[PDB]
Amino acid sequence: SAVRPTKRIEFTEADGDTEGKSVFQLEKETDKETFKIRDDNPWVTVETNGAVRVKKKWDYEELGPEKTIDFWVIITNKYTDNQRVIILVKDVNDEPPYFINRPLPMQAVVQLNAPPNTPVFTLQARDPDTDHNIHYFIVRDRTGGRFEVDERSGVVRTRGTDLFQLDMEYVLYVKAEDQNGQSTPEERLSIVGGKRAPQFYMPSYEAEIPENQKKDSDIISIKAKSFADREIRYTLKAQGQGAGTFNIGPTSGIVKLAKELDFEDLRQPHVYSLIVTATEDSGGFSTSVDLTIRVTDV
């Protein structure tokens, strides 16, 4: 027949990242066949010998919604053959955006007399694909319409002139969506009127240290965010065993080893459970978090 079975083949965007690179060889039914493209294609040239070469550096986003380099070839040696070539192009960078806001869950405060269009928090997601653009939006507003999000910047801004209530929680569920390839999870943003307690940069902390850890060496750094941007004082208590084995820097949040350790001494536990407290001298507010320290033998 005049038409050959359609050549189907899969390559990544990156396989086509260099002009003139021979991606694949089109097969010939007879030794003396020569190839020629039917229509000029922006992405590929076809050599006389059937080698398919990168013309313009492949860009998945720039392909039609089909995501294929789709072209025909003429085969000869008139009595000529025709064959369709469909290169399915895979965008291997195309993985969903994720929020890079820290700490999670998303927490902000709103000034009680915040005037309209006061920014209270900036949503920041990252698309691992550098070639993608994302839009931020609210999927569920539990604030009674007191906040909106800028789709470009991710900035969350107050609306209306009414006051906000002290200690009152305003909740938005927010999402960033890809304009190319997927989205973030629908994350919960908690905005509290006026002030709220410090939030640790991790919901729990875990350290693993050898038996021979040097006395007064740093074991783990703990940090809490003060929403009032006020001074944080850290304290550390032991849950059960190990009181006084570790301390934490009042200002630094750095947990050091206070005592020598013996793994073969069964008086000392192998897993220490500690609670770190972050205290604002901004008045009252404290938050606690678990710190778990495991000791390995050496």
Which residue lies nearer to Zn ion by CB, 51 or 247? 247
Q: Does 11 bind Zn ion (CB under 5 A)?
A: no
> Which residue type does 129 have?
D
Hey, what are 233's tokens?
């004082």
Q: Does 95 bind Ca ion (CB under 5 A)?
A: no
Q: 76 pairs with which residues across the strands?
A: 34
Which residue lies nearer to Ca ion by CB, 55 or 146? 55
Binding mask 232-271 for Zn ion (x = CB under 5 A): x------------------------------x-x-x----
Restricted to residues 92-121, the positions that interact with Zn ion (CB under 5 A) are 93
**Considering CB distances under 5 to 8 angstroms, the limit depending on partner class, which of Ca ion, Zn ion, none binds residue 148?**
none
The b/e string for 162-200 (b: 16+ C-beta within 10 A; e otherwise) is eebeeeeebebbbbbbbeebebbeebebbbbbbbbbbbb
Four-point Cα dihedral 22, 28, 31, 32, nearest 10: -80
Give the span between the Cα atoms of 193 and 160, in whole angstroms.
15
Restricted to residues 164-203, the positions that interact with Ca ion (CB under 5 A) are none
Part in contact with Ca ion (CB under 5 A); list of ranges 55-63, 64-72, 188-196, 213-221: 55-63
Query: Which residue in 151, 182, 190, 209 binds Zn ion (CB under 5 A)?
Result: 151
Which residue lies nearer to Zn ion by CB, 47 or 182? 182
**Considering CB distances under 5 to 8 angstroms, the limit depending on partner class, which of Zn ion, Ca ion, none binds residue 153?**
Zn ion
Among left, alpha and beta (phi > 0; psi -120 to 50; other), residue 36 is beta
Residue nearest to Ca ion (CB): 131
From residue 214, alpha-carbon distances to 89, 218, 225, 258, 261 in Å are 54, 9, 29, 9, 9
Part in contact with Zn ion (CB under 5 A); list of ranges 24-32, 65-73, 104-112, 221-229: 221-229
> Which residue type does 263 have?
F
Give the span between the Cα atoms of 124 and 154, in whole angstroms.
6
Q: How far is CA 59 from the centre of its chain?
A: 23
Beta 232-239 vs 205-210: how paired, if at all?
A: unpaired
Q: Does 1 bind Zn ion (CB under 5 A)?
A: yes
Q: Does 131 bind Ca ion (CB under 5 A)?
A: yes
Q: Does 61 bind Ca ion (CB under 5 A)?
A: yes
Give the span between the Cα atoms of 25 and 45, in whole angstroms.
12
Q: Does 141 bind Zn ion (CB under 5 A)?
A: no
Task: Please report, as ranges, the residues that interact with Zn ion according to CB under 5 A.
Answer: 1, 59-61, 91, 93, 129-131, 135, 150-153, 162, 211, 218, 229, 232, 263, 265, 267, 290, 297
